Amino acid sequence: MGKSEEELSDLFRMFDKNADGYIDLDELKIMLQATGETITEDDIEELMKDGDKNNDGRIDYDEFLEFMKGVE
């Protein structure tokens, strides 16, 4: 779209893998495996702390809306 929130929502489905509705470290590591670069679970855990604003253990679309600005 390009009008406002519509573009990041396509990326949330891109970041989510099993259609669970949240972005999780298990989902982040699959993207790193597709990328073919060094994989570090502790690095993925640091990404979870930036992504999980409410410390609920999951990255939700609202947590992601702030998160997508951090990663483009």
Among candidates 3, 4, 19, which has minimal Cα distance to 68? Answer: 4
Which range of residues in 4-12, 20-28, 34-42, 64-72 is near Ca ion by CB under 5 A?
20-28
Do residues 23 and 12 lie in contact, with contact meaning Cβ atoms separated by under 8 Å? Answer: yes
Does residue 62 bind Ca ion (CB under 5 A)? no
Does residue 58 bind Ca ion (CB under 5 A)? yes
Tally the residues of the chain.
72
Closer residue to Ca ion, CB minimum distance, 29 or 58: 58
Positions in the binding site for Ca ion (CB under 5 A): 16, 20, 22, 27, 52, 54, 56, 58, 63
